Amino acid sequence: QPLRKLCILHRNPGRCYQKIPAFYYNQKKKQCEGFTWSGCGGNSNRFKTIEECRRTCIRK
């Protein structure tokens, strides 16, 4: 399901020690900016590669 609301919640790292740096869709720009994930908190919008982010958040 391309362009899902899960990509609209911005980065969701949570309060849990800092551990999985990745990317999130920057709805200021138009692409996946980088962010730092934590460990056990927040929704999702966790995208490893920028393409992979735009495939689901910006459409394939």
Coordinates of C-alpha atoms in Angstrom, one line a residue:
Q1 CA 0.0 0.0 0.0
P2 CA 2.1 3.0 -1.3
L3 CA 1.9 6.4 0.5
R4 CA 0.8 5.0 3.9
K5 CA 0.1 7.1 7.0
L6 CA 2.9 5.2 8.8
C7 CA 5.3 7.4 6.8
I8 CA 3.5 10.6 8.1
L9 CA 4.4 10.0 11.9
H10 CA 8.0 11.2 11.3
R11 CA 11.0 9.5 13.0
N12 CA 10.0 7.4 16.1
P13 CA 13.2 6.5 18.0
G14 CA 11.8 6.4 21.5
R15 CA 13.5 6.7 25.0
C16 CA 15.7 3.5 24.9
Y17 CA 19.5 4.0 24.9
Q18 CA 20.4 5.0 21.1
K19 CA 21.2 2.0 18.8
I20 CA 19.9 1.7 15.2
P21 CA 20.7 4.8 13.0
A22 CA 18.6 4.9 9.9
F23 CA 16.3 7.4 8.1
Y24 CA 12.7 8.9 8.2
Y25 CA 10.6 10.8 5.7
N26 CA 11.2 14.6 6.3
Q27 CA 7.8 16.2 5.5
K28 CA 9.7 19.6 5.2
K29 CA 11.8 18.3 2.3
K30 CA 10.5 15.5 0.1
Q31 CA 12.8 12.5 0.9
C32 CA 14.1 10.4 3.8
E33 CA 16.4 12.4 6.0
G34 CA 18.6 10.5 8.4
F35 CA 17.7 9.9 12.1
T36 CA 18.9 7.9 15.1
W37 CA 16.7 5.1 16.5
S38 CA 16.9 4.1 20.2
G39 CA 15.8 0.6 21.3
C40 CA 12.1 0.1 22.4
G41 CA 9.8 3.0 21.7
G42 CA 7.7 5.1 19.2
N43 CA 5.7 4.0 16.1
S44 CA 7.8 3.2 13.1
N45 CA 8.9 5.3 9.9
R46 CA 12.2 3.4 10.3
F47 CA 13.8 3.2 6.8
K48 CA 17.4 1.8 6.3
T49 CA 17.9 3.1 2.7
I50 CA 16.5 6.3 1.2
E51 CA 15.1 4.6 -1.9
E52 CA 13.4 2.0 0.2
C53 CA 11.8 5.0 2.1
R54 CA 10.7 6.8 -1.0
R55 CA 9.3 3.4 -2.5
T56 CA 6.6 3.2 0.2
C57 CA 6.4 6.9 1.4
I58 CA 6.9 8.7 -1.9
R59 CA 5.8 5.9 -4.3
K60 CA 7.7 3.4 -6.5

